[PDB]
Amino acid sequence: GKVCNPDNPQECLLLEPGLNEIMANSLDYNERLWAWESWRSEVGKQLRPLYEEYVVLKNEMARANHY
Amino acid sequence: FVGWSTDWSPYADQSIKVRISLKSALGDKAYEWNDNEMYLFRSSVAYAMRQYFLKVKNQMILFGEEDVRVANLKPRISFNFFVTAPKNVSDIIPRTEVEKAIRMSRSRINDAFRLNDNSLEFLGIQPTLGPPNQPP
Amino acid sequence: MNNAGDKWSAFLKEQSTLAQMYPLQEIQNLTVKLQLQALQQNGSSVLSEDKSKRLNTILNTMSTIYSTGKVCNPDNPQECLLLEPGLNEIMANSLDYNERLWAWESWRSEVGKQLRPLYEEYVVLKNEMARANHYEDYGDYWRGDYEVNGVDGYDYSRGQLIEDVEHTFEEIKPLYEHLHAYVRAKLMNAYPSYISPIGCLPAHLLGDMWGRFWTNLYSLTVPFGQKPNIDVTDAMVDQAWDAQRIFKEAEKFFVSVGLPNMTQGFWENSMLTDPGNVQKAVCHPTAWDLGKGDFRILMCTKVTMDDFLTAHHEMGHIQYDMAYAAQPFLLRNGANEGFHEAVGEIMSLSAATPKHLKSIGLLSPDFQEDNETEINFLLKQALTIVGTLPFTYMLEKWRWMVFKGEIPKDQWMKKWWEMKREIVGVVEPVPHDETYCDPASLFHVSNDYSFIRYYTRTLYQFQFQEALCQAAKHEGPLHKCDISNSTEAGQKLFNMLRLGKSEPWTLALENVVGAKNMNVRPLLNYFEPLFTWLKDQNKNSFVGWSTDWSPYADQSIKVRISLKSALGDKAYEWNDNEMYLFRSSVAYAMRQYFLKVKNQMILFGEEDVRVANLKPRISFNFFVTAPKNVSDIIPRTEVEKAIRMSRSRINDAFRLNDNSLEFLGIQPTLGPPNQPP
Ligand SMILES: *[C@@H]1O[C@H](CO)[C@@H](O[C@@H]2O[C@H](CO)[C@@H](O[C@@H]3O[C@H](CO)[C@@H](O)[C@H](O)[C@@H]3O)[C@H](O)[C@H]2NC(C)=O)[C@H](O)[C@H]1NC(C)=O
Ligand SMILES: *[C@@H]1O[C@H](CO)[C@@H](O[C@@H]2O[C@H](CO)[C@@H](O[C@@H]3O[C@H](CO)[C@@H](O)[C@H](O)[C@@H]3O)[C@H](O)[C@H]2NC(C)=O)[C@H](O)[C@H]1NC(C)=O
Ligand SMILES: *[C@@H]1O[C@H](CO)[C@@H](O[C@@H]2O[C@H](CO)[C@@H](O)[C@H](O)[C@H]2NC(C)=O)[C@H](O)[C@H]1NC(C)=O
Ligand SMILES: *[C@@H]1O[C@H](CO)[C@@H](O)[C@H](O)[C@H]1NC(C)=O
Ligand SMILES: *[C@@H]1O[C@H](CO)[C@@H](O)[C@H](O)[C@H]1NC(C)=O
Ligand SMILES: *[C@@H]1O[C@H](CO)[C@@H](O)[C@H](O)[C@H]1NC(C)=O
Ligand SMILES: *[C@@H]1O[C@H](CO)[C@@H](O)[C@H](O)[C@H]1NC(C)=O
Ligand SMILES: *[C@H]1O[C@H](CO)[C@@H](O)[C@H](O)[C@H]1NC(C)=O
Ligand SMILES: *[C@H]1O[C@H](CO)[C@@H](O)[C@H](O)[C@H]1NC(C)=O
Ligand SMILES: [Zn+2]
């Protein structure tokens, strides 16, 4: 997953480097809020339908396995 | 104060509450308020913000339908919306400017949904009926 | 390198400041006058500190944006593509209309929009700098490279360049029309139902991102695919031609015309072979004139015909550099920006002839060339040479009109695509408003490089070649001409090569072609055998193009709005916000139709309703695409049904009633008249 600064969209940040440093070191409310919202709007939206299908399939498998 | 309350939110200070009564204004032939209607309402709000920022402050700000954030949606069609910067999430337009924008272009929003100032209440924006003209 | 460049720049600028003590009005020596002119140009130093810093910042930002631009596939946004790798391969190899269209639109919507305001500021700052440097605009400063004064006959005003370019292009246009017609006819067989035989070519189907070159289209437009092209790479491999004897053969070819031998240190200091992974080095073939008789060539040469031609080109470059060694340092350059590349390229053009290959031994002596092979070779050359002339001329004309201010800032794309339709014959696949900055997406536009150099260089070389074929006494076709073993042609070429910049470029031209100005007649003489074949081939096809047809015109719905008639007074102005509201209403109507009829949840947006041909009447054409699939356009029938379903909401949104909001194809129903019992 990559999040890119709106001021400079040419630069983008992964999660393990950079973004974690931003969330664990920066004292700026604006920067931390941007990182939080960008990660949860650029990766969560892509994981929503996949997670729905995963939930349905896992439920079917568990019910088939007598759970 | 030990503890916390489940009502306060950081965006609650700059939120404008909208309550819509379609059935009372239209009686029958009243459309359902699905997600498409919410998208249209957000687009209308963004258009009103653009108009205010262009015709008052002379600034060209490219608002969008994703810049009008909506929360606390209810079956009453009663929610809280607030407008952020076009690409700066940390920047939220102060409620005074949003109220002025809505007052400037409330007629267009009212006509977009065929509502008249009573079924589209912004809870802080009080419309003016108009002065009564008198005989000579 | 950084330290050396900074020291050189500081020395150059301090010498420029010192040189102002000698005004040009009292200088009588021509060479001294022009050397002072070289050392007296202020450049960006004439601007204030803040303006100069802003100009440098915006230039660097545009360069970085172009270099590191990324486009990501909507299906898998986690993968993204740069421009040099991947995207160029997609545009030069893929045969899918959808994929090429996606690449084109994604690159021009993810990088042009970022380069629009930067390019505007760059235009303003460059105009201010040029006006401060006593030029009418930046375009005049660019054209000043060809300026010649005080020669009594050879004088060439800056404004004369525009006339010379337009008059020349008027003669190229007849050939380009037939070439375009043939290319369109051949492309209709590869992309059926997407190209109209009467209309123009779509922008993305030109075998390149911008359509500057048509070389990659040669695979789809080969005249005679059954006859193979002339390739001697296998012959080189069989004869074991390493990257050491090809340069020897090129040196022998250069000597055969009388040019001097290579320097002793040239072979020692060269890098004719790639140093492998042990030593990292660039692989762009370049020529270096370090000075004091130091000439070197850098190239990761392999065993290929393309490498052979590139080696000949680089040897031509270094020969030209050696020619003006005796000239002063300020004169160690070509006559202008177009002479050097033309001199380099004529050698490659001559060496590629089958006669030269047969003579050198690469081509078997028992090989008789057929006219079909000549047609194939001429068409391959044409797709590279004649393909770029209209695009180069159109781009330079657009830049000149932008800098001169003839094009308003709110009319850049509207005029750019109008020029491209009526000059290049290329129609955009999707409409672009003033937000896009498509011309800035090109390498030479964002990075502040003059583009007219690629135009005149196309002409000059031919004017050289024809001249070099007159001294060599060649009676056959121009494309079969070879200058080997022609001492007279070599002497004629050297007479101009030794001049360098010491003389006006017009005088240099007169020493070779016998004329003072550029002429395109040699180009037509070169391409005549292909021109006749193309004219014979287009007996049935409609030669030319129309500037009205567009790929999106079939699925477009036309809207005409009359606010004043419906509202009289108290009528709002139709600015961009109203257009945004209309697009949002259309998207909402499309959502409603797709939800309440087909039961499909499609998340349309205001950017999926593309609008074109906006007019003061408030009359435009709109069409709705897929939510994230540009190549997918909703058929007009479904859009009409959607509008009919929810026309009342759109009418009420603008306070119009079915007469001031006309969709030109959607006829409203007044309602049946009820009758008494
Ligand atoms: C997005 O909007 C926020 C506002 O909600 C912007 O934050 C503002 O940024 C400016 C520029 O740094 C700040 O001004 C500076 O404030 C510091 C505070 O000590 C001061 O020392 C500096 O001299 C300067 O005045 C401003 O205070 C700040 N406002 C808030 C409320 O944080 C933010 O920059 C915007 N982001 C983008 C990308 O435009
Ligand atoms: C965006 O929309 C376009 C349609 O405008 C989609 O193109 C369509 O893609 C499908 C899937 O490959 C094609 O079906 C295939 O066609 C080939 C043609 O030979 C056939 O051999 C296959 O068996 C299969 O039926 C379809 O023809 C094609 N339609 C057009 C007009 O090109 C495109 O896939 C969409 N893009 C995305 C990312 O959804
Ligand atoms: C213009 O100046 C050049 C440069 O001096 C003159 O060319 C010769 O340059 C060499 C080396 O600089 C001198 O030793 C010669 O005396 C210069 N003149 C000649 C005739 O060789 C050039 O002659 C000058 N031209 C005019 C018209 O003054
Ligand atoms: C360059 O700038 C200087 C002052 O900075 C000025 O005197 C001069 O006229 C300008 N032009 C040239 C050609 O030197
Ligand atoms: C040029 O040099 C090569 C060897 O470096 C030599 O064989 C050749 O004869 C020279 N050319 C002439 C014209 O002497
Ligand atoms: C080549 O010459 C033959 C012989 O007349 C002719 O039939 C053929 O059409 C020619 N082809 C081209 C491409 O000129
Ligand atoms: C040129 O001269 C060389 C040297 O005699 C000879 O081998 C060659 O056949 C001549 N012709 C060409 C086209 O190179
Ligand atoms: C009520 O008054 C306000 C300002 O006093 C005005 O903007 C508004 O249009 C009025 N409403 C009417 C006349 O219906
Ligand atoms: C006209 O007729 C069409 C279908 O016949 C209907 O959808 C439309 O609402 C009618 N318009 C009126 C009654 O104003
Ligand atoms: Zn070159």
Author numbering:
A (entry chain B): 130 to 196
B (entry chain B): 603 to 738
C (entry chain A): 62 to 738
Quoted from the paper:
Several plasma membrane transporters import proline into the cell, including the Sodium/imino-acid transporter 1 (SIT1) encoded by the SLC6A20 gene. SIT1 belongs to the SLC6 gene family of amino acid and amine transporters, and the larger Neurotransmitter Sodium Symporter (NSS) superfamily. SIT1 adopts the classic LeuT-fold expected for this family of amino acid transporters, while ACE2 is composed of peptidase (PD) domain and collectrin-like domain with transmembrane and neck regions.
Further classifying the 2:2 ACE2-SIT1 complex data, there are two distinct conformations based on the relative domain orientations within the ACE2 dimer. This movement between open and closed conformations occurs as a 30° rigid-body rotation around a hinge at residues 612-617 in the loop between peptidase and collectrin-like domains. As with the ACE2-B0AT1 structure, a second dimer interface is formed by Gln139 and Gln175 within the peptidase domain in ACE2’s closed conformation. Further, the branched N-glycan chain at ACE2’s Asn690 is rigid and well-ordered in the open conformation, hydrogen bonding with asparagine, aspartate, and glutamate side chains on the peptidase domain’s H6 and beta-hairpin between H4 and H5. Accordingly, the glycan density is weaker in this conformation as the chain becomes more mobile. The greatest movement is a rigid body 17° tilt of TM1a. Within the SIT1 map determined in glycine, there is no apparent density for amino acid or chloride, though the binding site is similarly resolved to the pipecolate bound structure.
